[PDB]
Ligand binder design. Structure first.
Ligand SMILES: CC(C)CCC[C@@H](C)[C@H]1CC[C@H]2[C@@H]3CC=C4C[C@@H](O)CC[C@]4(C)[C@H]3CC[C@]12C
Ligand SMILES: CC(C)CCC[C@@H](C)[C@H]1CC[C@H]2[C@@H]3CC=C4C[C@@H](O)CC[C@]4(C)[C@H]3CC[C@]12C
Ligand SMILES: CC(C)CCC[C@@H](C)[C@H]1CC[C@H]2[C@@H]3CC=C4C[C@@H](O)CC[C@]4(C)[C@H]3CC[C@]12C
Ligand SMILES: CC(C)CCC[C@@H](C)[C@H]1CC[C@H]2[C@@H]3CC=C4C[C@@H](O)CC[C@]4(C)[C@H]3CC[C@]12C
Lengths: 247, 247, 247, 247
């Protein structure tokens, strides 16, 4: 069905390119504070700068490819939309693969560009001092929960009171998550974004947190928005059939 | 009437969950500047970061549950909407109870997560040096007045010139209040948000300010918007009947 | 005509109250960096905080009273709308008087609240070191020019491509002007806002700049938008009659 | 055709004036951190302030002259719209000339205003220490690519899901590019903006990067958005005829 449709592959390529741009721009803005290399200054990372960079990248790329691919740009958001029965399993898998490949390519290109930084971590997400696995896991769970909840509520298609720009809302949610989690874990929040940095830097220390926590948060957000707050008056079998049909 | 309706209880649970997420994310972003614990640095709290975190949390959760619960997320805003005769007394009481419980739960969860911080105040609102009870009370009154005025003017339902995103407007109002009041009192502005921190930290010093001042500001905003600027051409008895009817 | 209409006086009172809230909140956020008084720290004023406070105050109060008074909140913007023949002369004079009185009241209330600050200038706009009268005058002219141009283009009523929130656009224009002019002159940009601080602090040094420059910028913006970019296909006599008719 | 139309010349003058205002305000906000001159402090440039100034200037001027000139304000964006066959070659050339002249005039006026700064570079874009020609070229390419992609996707005219303010989206894209590239190259991103500073400061060191990289990024964005993601079902000859017809 969707395997032989041109629009599906265009959406996959759009997700790949937009994830590449998002990862590259956001991590490049995150690593900007270490420049100039020659100037010896005790520069402090600005959380507002990085959070706004992530949020505006999400908003801009969502405005770019919302009508083309739905503007997922996150394996956790894609998995949440799969669990809310909006996209097919094959589409979700292709989106996750494209996002991971794009993040890896973007991180490699940035590491080539930012090769002058000694000991460059390429914005790799890791636990800060004083934060163990459980606390960072909970922070990631809450951030991805609010992000997936915002995504689900924005793309409900049953609401006539919606106003403003949906890409702006998604970007502000991402920026909120970053303002929350940068000081704690660097705000992984995106399994592809952390996975690309882990692959390029050859460091997978505490990498399971940024793949499990976002998925748990997305699943909790789906459970809440679909069975507590705004239930849908449809049979479960029909929504399960969307996984094998994609419509 | 509303006691036996499923939608009312779904709205109450939505208010509870959204208040939990708001309090947790906002206070976690406020306490982020103290990390890493091992690194001994004279870190300075960024007011822009905390104000944007509060505002974007308000905007995101309002976008999430506006069609479900009305997106109050504030005992002062709920009391103002009660005094403007838009919601029933029972609904207002349930919203206040849910917001307080959610704030307490969020503060407890964050204190569990942020247990590594020595002498962690959990973002407890208190008077700064040089500010007495009256000055902080006035600052809180003005901030809650502008917030409740924005909420009332946005949800007027008689205006056809409204544009953009209403959750964005509410979030920007909250961020404005925080930019005003963080340096003075930490911008309590929300009786549930301060109440949860006071309960968890077992400190109620000058806690009456953050419960009286927001209520006074909300009442003043209701009085202004309903009897000076945009009066409603309806009898007072019919609006009083909304308290016992909820319609 | 308009002297005996209730809506005109409600609009005047709305302008007064919104200008009071704007001046109070914005200057209070500007003076926040000097707290705590007891703590001896070399605190540096954050231009982003003050600019965002001014912009969000403008946006929130415009969202509050746009349908009531038109949300001028600036003697320069009011004079520009008078010169673009949208409001009457009496309405413009009443708006200017109300804005000045509200700014004076707000500055007095804040000085009462911020009395603990030694040598508190109450956010009085003055020329910085290295900037003479001409340079600050030009900066104020450009800032008010872009602000009045944005106000005129937003409230054109002939454009069907308008989107988003107009109060948000006006607030972002104000924040842009502040990001431009805070380091130079403190971004007066509003004759009432500077006038209130000058009256309360009993200091009128270089105060003519903040009353002449904004007016010149507004007049230039009106001239441009009405005779170079988007001319109106109406006789000049009919537009002059709006000054004595108000319709 | 368009040479004898008044609206075309009004659009050209609007582009000139808006580019002048954009360059002047943005570079003035960028150079604000060096004041006061007499006060000897180790002031650090705030990237958030400069990025927000650029973005809000773009958004405000786009809101001002979108219905008049299309709000290009960038030779790279104008070239991208020419390559996407939306504007004529003569219109693109006139827009580029007007933008360059306006940027030169704005930089000269600001240098007159900011003459008190010793060794004032007038915000001239140059490679930072540790960044060679290739890395800065790639950063500029990516920033202009995302900017032109956002511009093309926003002004598609085939999308009915668009919401919010398009000038706000363009301004947020510009602010995102600045948050990315300020630490690396100062975020040239606009050939006119860098060209004016280079002409006024009489320094063209590494100036080819800020004229080649933005053009490459715009061309890549046009290629992507027009042949990979959202192809148009029209013959190439008809779109080529727009270059000589302008319709
Ligand atoms: C992503 C695309 C569209 C734009 C960026 C690609 C180009 C400009 C980038 C990507 C990889 C980069 C190279 C990566 C590594 C190095 C080694 C270093 O010692 C000198 C610079 C050099 C040789 C870089 C030059 C610029 C470069 C070729
Ligand atoms: C709110 C939900 C959905 C997510 C967060 C819940 C989980 C991940 C949090 C909440 C309470 C947390 C615990 C609170 C206290 C402590 C004691 C400390 O010495 C080690 C960590 C530990 C044991 C935390 C581990 C993580 C934890 C269990
Ligand atoms: C504007 C309205 C709605 C709210 C603010 C008004 C009230 C709370 C403010 C305005 C003026 C203020 C007073 C101004 C001056 C002083 C003197 C000082 O040594 C102690 C505090 C005291 C006595 C302030 C107390 C609080 C105060 C009374
Ligand atoms: C762009 C327009 C609308 C507003 C700005 C124009 C005016 C106010 C500006 C532009 C050029 C400026 C002059 C440029 C250079 C100098 C030399 C210096 O030693 C004293 C100030 C002085 C004499 C400036 C005074 C103010 C000035 C005349």
């Amino acid at each position: 069905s969707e395997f032989k449709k041109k629009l599906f592959w265009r959406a996959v390529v759009a997700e790949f390119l937009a994830t590449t741009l998002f990862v590259f721009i956001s991590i490049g803005s995150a690593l900007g504070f270490k420049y100039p290399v020659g100037n010896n200054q005790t520069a402090v990372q600005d959380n507002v700068k990085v959070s706004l960079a992530f949020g505006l990248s999400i908003a801009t790329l969502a405005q770019s490819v919302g009508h083309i691919s739905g503007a997922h740009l996150n394996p956790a958001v894609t998995l949440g939309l799969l669990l809310s029965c909006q996209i097919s399993i094959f589409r979700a898998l292709m989106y996750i693969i494209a996002q991971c490949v794009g993040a890896i390519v973007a991180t490699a290109i940035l590491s080539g560009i930012t090769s002058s930084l000694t000991g460059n971590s390429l914005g790799r997400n890791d636990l800060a001092d004083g934060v163990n696995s459980g606390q960072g896991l909970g922070i990631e769970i809450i951030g991805t929960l609010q992000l997936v909840l915002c995504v689900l509520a924005t793309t409900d298609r049953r609401r006539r009171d919606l106003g403003g720009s949906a890409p702006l809302a998604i970007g502000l949610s991402v920026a909120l998550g970053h303002l929350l989690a940068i000081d704690y874990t660097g705000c992984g929040i995106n399994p592809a974004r952390s996975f690309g940095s882990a692959v390029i830097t050859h460091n997978f220390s505490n990498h399971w947190i940024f793949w499990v926590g976002p998925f748990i948060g997305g699943a909790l957000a789906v459970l809440i928005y679909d069975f507590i707050l705004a239930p849908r008056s449809s049979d479960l079998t029909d929504r399960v059939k969307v996984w094998t049909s994609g419509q």
